[PDB]
Design a protein around this ligand. Structure first.
Ligand SMILES: O=C(O)c1ccc2nc(-c3cc(Cl)cc(Cl)c3)oc2c1
Ligand SMILES: O=C(O)c1ccc2nc(-c3cc(Cl)cc(Cl)c3)oc2c1
Lengths: 115, 115, 115, 115
């Protein structure tokens, strides 16, 4: 599990459940190719997006669909989504956790990178 | 204005208005002595807390009454208040802005220290 | 000034100065069209991006060049940039401030929308 | 495990290891009584602070010793510590995770409360 995404809700004080997440990888023709996608679990975690074989060096974009999350809770939020863009595996394979903390008009994100 | 406090609301996407803020200075007998206080303005700012002459080096605590702010909005909060504890150090001319971003179950704070 | 961007540095406790910021507007053919850009000031603010006449309703993307900012400080960063994507909605007179707080492996952003 | 504390480092992109944490509980004579303490593990988590029997209703303060954490890494930070103050178990037992994300001049905290 080299890429995991964890999403928390700062209004409710809970994991953000059923949040859609799309991962893209930058291609040779300077375009965002689809790479993996999933939804967060009851623990607000999304596991199994990729494998050590598939997750090669590259520039990745993790798009967290915060707007649909807030709209499903009957709230009109500010952002369309939260995007996290980074170079991965540049000095060999690493394990990445991308965490996001959400509020209707704000979000924070951090990365935990382990070898 | 050597010390200013700015408070933002992450739920409404606005300044946090009429928030009570209490500042204390640590005294030699390990006790917190009231130093300054006020309510944030319509811009979520609290100016005029102290003067350069009164704001000496030492340990200060800024306590933001977040619970009353959320209750006045009819929103259920987690924290009793938000406390920011720091040391004021004289090292050339310095202005301290303590900023806080509030959500019901979370808060963030940063210091903007400038000449 | 209907759109302002403010960027803070969580490592140095200061405004993030001379940060490049690019704003784009979403066009009918699902593409991002350049809209406005600039570099943050000594106060970490970028004023004068647009005018009330040019800033129509629509989806906007604010891309903050965080990687170049950290490299100029000799600090190793994680993100390629920070992107803030939102919808501008006309509902009475509104000013949008997009604020971001930067750290090498994390960032937070909030919207301050006022009359 | 009704009370857990998780601490992340936003500069390194890692768990914040060996962070001291002290928990206090407000007493009848309006004083902060010591309740539990520990240090975060290699995963930046602190488990086993208390038991469901001991963790009764009350106002608790979780003090995270961020200053000693940054000083042990050879960095001079802004805050003395990060304090999280909240009422616990007011409507019966709950499980609380207090998470904190640290930078030298800033911190964020959130709570995950589950039944
Ligand atoms: O000094 C001012 O005028 C000023 C303005 C905007 C500001 N936005 C913040 C802020 C933003 C985020 Cl995303 C997280 C945190 Cl902790 C703080 O602090 C500000 C200070
Ligand atoms: O409980 C866990 O396992 C777990 C994991 C990753 C986590 N990242 C956060 C986090 C992120 C931001 Cl951007 C701000 C703050 Cl305050 C916290 O909390 C986590 C908790």
């Amino acid at each position: 599990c080299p890429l995991m995404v964890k999403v928390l809700d700062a209004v409710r004080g809970s994991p953000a459940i059923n949040v859609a997440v799309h991962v893209f990888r930058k291609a040779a023709a300077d375009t965002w190719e689809p790479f993996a996608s999933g939804k967060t679990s009851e623990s607000g975690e999304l596991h199994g997006l990729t494998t050590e074989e598939e997750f090669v060096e590259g520039i990745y974009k993790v798009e967290i669909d915060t707007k649909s999350y807030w709209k499903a809770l009957g709230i009109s939020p500010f952002h369309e989504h939260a995007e996290v863009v980074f170079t991965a595996n540049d000095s060999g394979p690493r394990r990445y956790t991308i965490a996001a903390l959400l509020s209707p008009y704000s979000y924070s994100t951090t990365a935990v990178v382990t070898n």
